[model samples]
Target: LYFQGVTATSNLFPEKQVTLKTVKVTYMFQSKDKDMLDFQWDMNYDANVLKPTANTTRAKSFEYPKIGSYVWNSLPGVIKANGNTLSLYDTTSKEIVFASAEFEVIDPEATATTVNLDVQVLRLSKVDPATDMEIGDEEVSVADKSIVDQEVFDKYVVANNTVTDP
Candidate 1:
């Protein structure tokens, strides 16, 4: 059985004023044994704290999902990504980036922020040229979790050019 899963990557930023700065998060998929033909997932985050922007970038191979555009963010902090093979190429082993998005920090006080991704569907197919077709419905799983540590400082020590830790 092949192992297929999804994961996310982002940075932990210091507390900032509302709309002062922004952060980005990227999601990707990895298949250990089979070659991926298509995939889709939903990215969920704290809508109250991070506000999604119109800016987003998808992989050139599968720019849009089978149904809608990958730039759909009508929901507050939730977006869905869908993509499939354009030709007969297979997305195997190596990390296949699904999509990435930018968000403005709406709440500086927000703590323990995390960007989570849930796999909706993933199709794995045979790599060989023997009537290339899906082997079967493979089970897809998401990562354990991403622990984000936030530092909220109240006072700044200009004399020493330092700020107190939270």
Candidate 2:
């Protein structure tokens, strides 16, 4: 898709071996207009799969380096992650998160499997949300997530992928 000042992408193996079941799900985040409220990362995977950094099997394997000082001060300075969902929200008028983030991926018995990862940058689209319409920050209230200004996100798009072999 057409885009700019927007750096969002991921590295997903469409097919991996049981020998390589434990994968590093790497993703990048970049921004010039930092007016976003939250990044919602939703995942759907076989129950047999899970986190790499969870158990002592791998300690602190997952990583989310500082995006920037402004962005950190706005939020609690920690990514909110649980179960099959992970998120980053701007509780204040935070700035940018131009960096890389990664999570540990694991498959039971090193068996072939698949996982669906869907990511979206969301702000208050609008109070009166409408289809086929342009909604800007002016229409949104502070009660909404502080992702970015209106035009900033229109250029942005959600990204996701699934790797399989099961």
Candidate 3:
């Protein structure tokens, strides 16, 4: 089964953060299996607390094989899962680190301190990216929960390097 998704993490302490120079809010991917071609998904987040910028990493993406196959890596070759949209692809199963979208608090009224996001598994399968024929749906949905239940995390480990002057 192929597994893919987006998860959230934060270095913002989530309680008191008046001295933090930068809060790193991440949006990562969890790739399922190998041999997936076309992909298009969306993630919804609260714009009040977190504001995503253009800084993002894109997946190498997928395409037609030259009468051959691409090596599988088991990780999501994520294109871009930052902001509110995500488009990933992988004919070669690779590591699923996707990209981490760094968010900065802009609105003063924003108080919530969580990444806060949702997903839409728009197209998940080995379908003809040129057509609408889906051939790899069951393989993906079945493992979606298993991967998250066993792999996702609620926290992030980071080092404070900022020299706050007294």
Candidate 4:
């Protein structure tokens, strides 16, 4: 059966134009039940409009030394991320920040853009203390349990293209 106890969502800080250049986006999950141990997913952004900053991905609430808590920029506009926790995270109303990345606006004059997370195929895992590995694997689909959110960057001035508010 599919896992219904947790929700995966993404967030963008300063979701609108704080300035006109950069933004920080976070990917995380919220758990009603705390058996979640490992997860991996794909992230997509606009390559023509935004470029990921160098060495920007960081592990928050949880980290996995085994996997090295990575955000792999496998291709332009596409990235892969994964991590594992030593212990199950406690249930909280707050989102458990697992991965965060910074993106620089390459074309601020362009129209609004968004960064999306893909978690339809890969499933989150439950830890087995005896084996120090995953035990139960439950699918996390797109619509119901996974509440994927995208980063929205507002458009710059239509009249003045040169004006970049610092």
Candidate 5:
């Protein structure tokens, strides 16, 4: 059977002073059997769970509503099947955060192409300083650059793939 691996991409900006609100996850699969193959997709977060679905030969997108690592998984349940796994984590901490997975299925005789899966973490609500502003020499807020720069994006890339500096 033919199997296509998974690739991930994202759009997170820290310097903009923005918090993730909505995240979009995309998965793509290709197979020669086409009609005989089935695709299943699964999404998971820190405490959230989503059921898997069937796909054929197109890309599927999912929206996340919080700031955390998310995992996406895709797999095939039929003949000549294959699966893919991926993760998306928030990089605003010392520990690796955020994760996701994806899976796909394919036919054995079909020529396989590289399949791509994208996960985007959208800023939902900003931690407003005025609401409960606490100032301290040793305490830091999630909005702090030190935390965001060193933790958030960095951890995110580690969980998914590489961190592109641009």
Candidate 6:
């Protein structure tokens, strides 16, 4: 399984601003044996456009820069059993799989102080089976839920630095 996306509050005060600095994507691979491997990830926005910022060889996590939408696709690889022949075991045996996840970088400064805004975002995944066929599906969904009122901003002095904590 893989972590595909992230969502955060979109409402912000005129005096309050927030910056989306980074994001992380997590993935997990399960095996029948008791041994398990954990991997770490980093984002490399300089690579492919709309794709993961980095490439990985094992199940792990990655980070992204800035706030925006990024699209990713999986590369080709092989998974073999103890024998040399290649085959698809039931979803239970060992099989090669592909999945995707997404994250966002938000700027609180863009929000209005007197008004609140709602935003919805979705992340999709591209899957390729051993047959060389490709398939797509939605993986993650996010929405912004913050009510902004003038009285509230005035009472709390909402600002970029002030909203960073929670």
How many pairs of residues collide in each model?
A: 1, 7, 11, 0, 37, 11
Candidate 3's displacement at residue 89, Å, is: 2.1
In candidate 1, the residue pairs with backbone N, CA or C atoms under 3 Å apart (3 or more residues apart, or in different chains) clash, namely 65-82
Q: How well does candidate 3 score on lDDT at residue 5?
A: 22
* Per-residue lDDT of candidate 3, residues 1-166 (tens digit): 5322222432211221233223443333334432333322332345555455444223221122222222212122222231111122442353332223344556644544544222222123444556634455423431231122212122111211211111
For model 5 the local lDDT of residue 31 reads 14
Arranged by TM-score with the best first, the candidates are 4, 1, 3, 2, 5, 6
Candidate 2's TM-score: 0.35
**Maximum-lDDT candidate:** 4
RMSD of each: 14.7, 12.8, 13.1, 12.9, 17.5, 18.1
In model 3, what is the error at residue 38, expressed in angstroms?
Answer: 5.2
**Per-residue lDDT for 22-128 in model 2, tens only?**
34343323323223333444333443344424321111212232321122111122232221111232222322222222324443444444433333334333222
lDDT for each residue of candidate 4 in 1-166, tens digit (9 for 90 to 100): 4221112123222222233456665544444333344455566777887787874544431333244343444478877765445453332335554445566777657635666655432233345668765555532321223433221012110110111122
What TM-score does each of the candidates earn?
Answer: 0.51, 0.35, 0.37, 0.52, 0.25, 0.20
Candidate 2, after superposition: displacement of residue 101 in Å?
A: 8.9
Ten-residue region with minimum lDDT total, candidate 4: 155-164
**Best by the TM-score measure:** 4
Model 3 misses residue 3 by how many Å? 32
lDDT of 6: 0.23
Error of 3 at 15 (Å): 16
Estimate the TM-score for candidate 4.
0.52
